[PDB]
Amino acid sequence: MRPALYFCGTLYERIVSRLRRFGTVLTGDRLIHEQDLEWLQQADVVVAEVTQPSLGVGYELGRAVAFNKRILCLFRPQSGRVLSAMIRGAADGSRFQVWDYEEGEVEALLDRYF
Amino acid sequence: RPALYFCGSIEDRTLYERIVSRLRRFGTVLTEGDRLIHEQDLEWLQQADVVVAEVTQPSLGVGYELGRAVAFNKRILCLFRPQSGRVLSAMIRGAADGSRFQVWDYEEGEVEALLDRYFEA
Ligand SMILES: CC(C)(C)C(=O)N1CCN(C(=O)C2=CN/C(=C3\C=CC(Cl)=CC3)N2)CC1
Ligand SMILES: CC(C)(C)C(=O)N1CCN(C(=O)C2=CN/C(=C3\C=CC(Cl)=CC3)N2)CC1
């Protein structure tokens, strides 16, 4: 099966270029929300870069958990930030995973996950 | 007693205290290692009758809570300050339907009158 992939967040372009080798990458304010929710529902795996705080990214992860999607969150500790306890605490190590990473290992990590 | 859930990114504290003081007049405010925090948060979110979120500061936690609340069909009120100089995320602004999910723009001074107006309907 070729998974439908959803990505949210030049580092993003490196991530999406690697994601493209495993499946199709799907990615008025009300129109944006409705289009976003249609893609989230079609996706087989939801990939989120969670290093920068975002209400949009968090909202997408919450809607994705309720649809029981496979989720992968990517966080850079070298950013100097401490990841939200709600994102870090949502991980179960299987369907919802939170991976700490360094800029240079983007491609090897995505290869290892898929 | 109606159960109210309040969230906001964590100066901001004193504005949050004014919000929670006003919320307390309409019901019990549930929100007054990391896995334990998440599980406790999800138990409160499920018990809530209305979810109140201050969405002026970007937060992954607040956004995650709103997303889980929408999937539970909760009545939701988001409070945003345009005078902060920020542009509210199109996902939060776009999630509003004007009834079950509402996004209200406000100025610091109208906190109490706005919460009175929402809970008097
Ligand atoms: C390289 C690309 C793929 C362009 C990238 O950097 N992305 C990261 C930022 N990003 C998002 O976080 C995101 C999630 N949903 C949406 C939209 C939903 C609906 C509509 Cl109409 C527009 C956008 N955006 C888009 C993908
Ligand atoms: C004055 C108070 C009420 C203290 C305030 O400023 N608050 C606003 C910020 N805030 C939150 O965004 C929030 C949502 N859920 C939680 C927790 C969930 C689980 C556990 Cl174990 C602890 C907290 N926190 C806490 C409440």
Buried b (16+ CB within 10 A) or exposed e, B80-99: bbeeeeeebbbbbbbbbeee
Q: What are φ and ψ of residue A111, in 5° steps?
A: -60, -45
Neighbours of A77 (CB within 10 A): 12
Residue A28, number of CB atoms within 10 A of its CB: 9
| Cα dihedral B66, B71, B76, B78 in deg (nearest 10) | 30
Question: Exposed, middle or buried by CB within 10 Å (0-12, 13-18, 19+), for A114?
Answer: middle
Question: For ligand 1, atom 10, which residue shows the shortest CA distance?
Answer: A8
**CA proximity to B97, closest of A45, A5, A35, A33:** A33
What does the CA dihedral A18, A21, A24, A30 come to, rounded to 10 degrees? 0
Query: With a 6 A CB cut-off, is B17 part of the ligand 2 pocket?
Result: yes
Q: Is the dihedral of CA A3, A7, A10, A11 positive or negative?
A: negative
Q: Which two tokens stand for residue A76?
A: 């850079």
- Residue A58 and residue B55: Cβ atoms within 8 Å? no
Pocket flag, ligand 2, residue B42 (CB < 6 Å):
no
Judged by CB atoms closer than 8 Å, whether chains meet at B37 and A63 is answered as: no
Q: Using beta carbons and an 8 Å cutoff, which residues of B are at the interface with A?
A: 9, 33-39, 41, 55, 58-72, 88-96
Residues 6+ apart with CB under 8 A from B112: B18, B22
Nearest CA to ligand 1 atom 22: A32
The end-to-end CA distance of chain B, in Å, is 16
CATH 3.40.50.450 assigned to B3-119: yes
Instruction: List the Cα angle B78/B83/B88 in 5-degree steps.
Output: 45
**Phi first, then psi: what are they for B2, rounded to 5°?**
-65, 140
- How remote is the CA of residue A6 from the centroid of ligand 1, in Å? 9
Question: By the 8 A CB rule, do A101 and A112 touch?
Answer: no
Topology of domain A4-113 in CATH is Rossmann fold (3.40.50)
Pick out the residues of the known binding site of A for 5-hydroxymethyl-dUMP: 9, 54, 56, 60, 84
Taking CA atoms only, the protein residue closest to ligand 1 atom 14 is: A8
Helix (H) or strand (E) holding B65: helix B60-71
Bridge partners for A25 per DSSP: A5
Q: How far apart are CA B89 and CA B92, in angstroms?
A: 6
How many residues are given for chain A?
Answer: 114
Contact A73/A87 with Cβ under 8 angstroms? yes
Which method resolved this structure? Answer: X-ray
Dist. CA A68–CA A74, nearest whole Å: 19
